[PDB]
Design an enzyme around this catalytic site. Sequence first.
Site, PDB file in Angstrom:
ATOM      1  N   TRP B 119      12.526  40.379 -19.445  1.00 60.59           N
ATOM      2  CA  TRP B 119      11.162  40.811 -19.232  1.00 60.59           C
ATOM      3  C   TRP B 119      11.144  42.329 -19.331  1.00 60.59           C
ATOM      4  O   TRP B 119      11.960  42.993 -18.704  1.00 60.59           O
ATOM      5  CB  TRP B 119      10.752  40.334 -17.843  1.00 60.59           C
ATOM      6  N   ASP B 200      16.094  37.064  -9.864  1.00 58.66           N
ATOM      7  CA  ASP B 200      14.672  37.179 -10.129  1.00 58.66           C
ATOM      8  C   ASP B 200      14.224  35.736 -10.365  1.00 58.66           C
ATOM      9  O   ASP B 200      14.658  35.089 -11.313  1.00 58.66           O
ATOM     10  CB  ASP B 200      14.451  38.067 -11.352  1.00 58.66           C
ATOM     11  N   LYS B 235       3.321  31.847 -11.060  1.00 61.73           N
ATOM     12  CA  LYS B 235       3.102  30.821 -12.066  1.00 61.73           C
ATOM     13  C   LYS B 235       3.075  29.496 -11.342  1.00 61.73           C
ATOM     14  O   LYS B 235       2.286  28.594 -11.615  1.00 61.73           O
TER      15      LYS B 235
END
Lengths: 385, 385
Positions: B119, B200, B235
């Site tokens: 990311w 993460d 999400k």
Amino acid sequence: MFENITAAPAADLFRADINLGIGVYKDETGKTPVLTSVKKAEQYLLENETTKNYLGIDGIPEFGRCTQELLFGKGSALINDKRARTAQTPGGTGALRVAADFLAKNTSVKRVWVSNPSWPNHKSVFNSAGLEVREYAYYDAENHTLDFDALINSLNEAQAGDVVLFHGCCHNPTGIDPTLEQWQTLAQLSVEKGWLPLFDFAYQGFARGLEEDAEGLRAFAAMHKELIVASSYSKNFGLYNERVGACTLVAADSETVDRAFSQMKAAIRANYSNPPAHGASVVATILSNDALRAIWEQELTDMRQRIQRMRQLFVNTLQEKGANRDFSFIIKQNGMFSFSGLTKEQVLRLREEFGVYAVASGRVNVAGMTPDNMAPLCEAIVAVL
Amino acid sequence: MFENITAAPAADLFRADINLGIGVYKDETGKTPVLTSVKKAEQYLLENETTKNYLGIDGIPEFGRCTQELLFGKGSALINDKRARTAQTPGGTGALRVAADFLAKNTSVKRVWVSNPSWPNHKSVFNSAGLEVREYAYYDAENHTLDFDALINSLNEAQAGDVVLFHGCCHNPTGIDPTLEQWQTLAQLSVEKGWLPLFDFAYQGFARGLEEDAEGLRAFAAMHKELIVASSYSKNFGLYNERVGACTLVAADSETVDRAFSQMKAAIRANYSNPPAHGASVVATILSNDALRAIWEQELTDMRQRIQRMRQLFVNTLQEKGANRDFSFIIKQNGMFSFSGLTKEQVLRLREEFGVYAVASGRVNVAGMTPDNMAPLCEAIVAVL
Ligand SMILES: Cc1ncc(COP(=O)(O)O)c(CNc2csc(C(=O)O)c2)c1O
Ligand SMILES: Cc1ncc(COP(=O)(O)O)c(CNc2csc(C(=O)O)c2)c1O
């Protein structure tokens, strides 16, 4: 990796068994309820929201517009000339940190000037961004007034390109604000000395009114090409835990503010990415709707007025309980906070012998006071004088 | 002050007139609706909240407990031994930044190792805190697999006391995750080399399931005294804009984690003060209620399964539209994202000639795909091969 970390430097005592060291507004019943305007807005959001898709880095556009109108006034030249850009942030603290990161990474700023006394988290925020914090004199402890000439004396040590932090209204902890004429003097001086003004505006509406409370900021904005405003809706919407604030950047023109603002957005992206919708959406919903805005403005007025009534009741009751000393400074001060004039040891005594809690500085939260608790509170104070 | 600031390095083209460059989940109708479990929780909060008073610096206690259970498992020794402390944060990004600030200010950490690719905001976040970012090899572009031996080769350049960032599951952008055996190898290596693992975890539940997706983290947690987890509910609860994440600190024992955590809280205090309640309260309300948790788990399962169906439909439809090339890697990959294998120029062509939008890397969001848009999407892709 963690075995040698030093503990951070160290309410609970209060709980273990009056709280004037509280940081929030309380009503006459000792509660901090959700504002009715807020509940109405939340119901509207529950009914109408169809997605939680990410906001832009700068948050809800309507929130930004409404914020700028609150700060600068409808029809402000700053707005008309598109000189201001606003990022919705997680609270006033988030706005201060975004300002600090922006300044540290994109400008030559090395130092921020803060009043002595101030909110204790100011130093932490600026230092976290790598900025030094210097103090300027503020408080005349004898007249319980703005030690103004001294303020100016302190600030002549500030170099061109230093930031000077001003509390917009309801100075925390003192409740002592510059008069409009003093704001005007400071605005002129700031231009002459090349300071970048940073306004911290957490209490708009709690001194005299929304428009009146912004006079100082607007005096600066009339004089300066550049400034930053870190504002909070935590106390004036009772939205503390929803983290609703704004960092407003002002530059000489639209080209310059947009370019600079791109770096403010980069600073946000690298921090929390984009801001929390719920609280800011409630603010935008309220501010942009005539009916909700009217209910909210009256609720804010009710808070402002209750605080004023407590300031008056405090002074009257202290006299009636046999303090033979002036406390008239309490009536004239603005917002939830004042220095009581008590020493750190008197404050300790108040806590230990009477169960009345203030901060060691002697700062008290006037909104912690009620018609019901005033007599015992004042009896306790008189006892430690 | 602002006249010389350089603009930050530069969806809109899409709007000006299929989006596979989207960052969120979409259902079969192309919408990102609020989850029903979330709406139910929000209604409960509207009905029952009596204050917006500030949360503690670390946020809602129940949120912390539920988070730790999700990450480590009910009955985990880490939980039982009180080795973990969780701060509720504004999103996974906020959790990463809190981790970075904590590490920069309180440890000797100077460097964070991130996979190539990752990311793009990882570099920004760590760099903002003053930490260098180094890359490790990850992707075998020929077998569309985990270039594992190479990963290990890259990481032997990491020094003891460096941080190594691992994506818990649904690696972004590749959808390629270590197998459990590979996680176990990495866990052993990390102990031997003295790395601090930083997990993460933004997609728990999107690969195989909540428990399965945490296997890798739990393999590390079984082997390490210390680690940090930056998790996100954006999400898996569809709570993107409410900014709901967690920074979980793990140390050898309760004394050490509490002491270290005090400095994590100081880092938060100096950033945004305390976290936004609404989104985290919805998560806590759902996770701690059997009925709501059941509805939510099924909604998450529906998302996971729809993504898998799109992966299968994508591969089948590409074959039917006359791609004579393997895309089986798509079926086996995890989460919303995969590399399509298209070059930056093919991606540009897709956008310009066909109005199909991906990122230049060739990463596509499989949740942007629907039974309705699949044929045209695949026809376009075949055309640029
Ligand atoms: C001068 C000033 N600057 C910044 C802030 C931060 O406000 P929020 O981050 O809570 O919106 C505040 C309000 N934050 C705050 C919560 S309790 C408290 C106190 O002084 O007791 C202060 C403030 O008074
Ligand atoms: C690996 C990884 N780390 C951190 C984050 C940040 O998540 P939130 O801050 O949105 O909760 C995310 C999710 N943030 C995100 C939004 S769009 C996107 C993308 O890759 O398109 C990513 C992630 O995938």
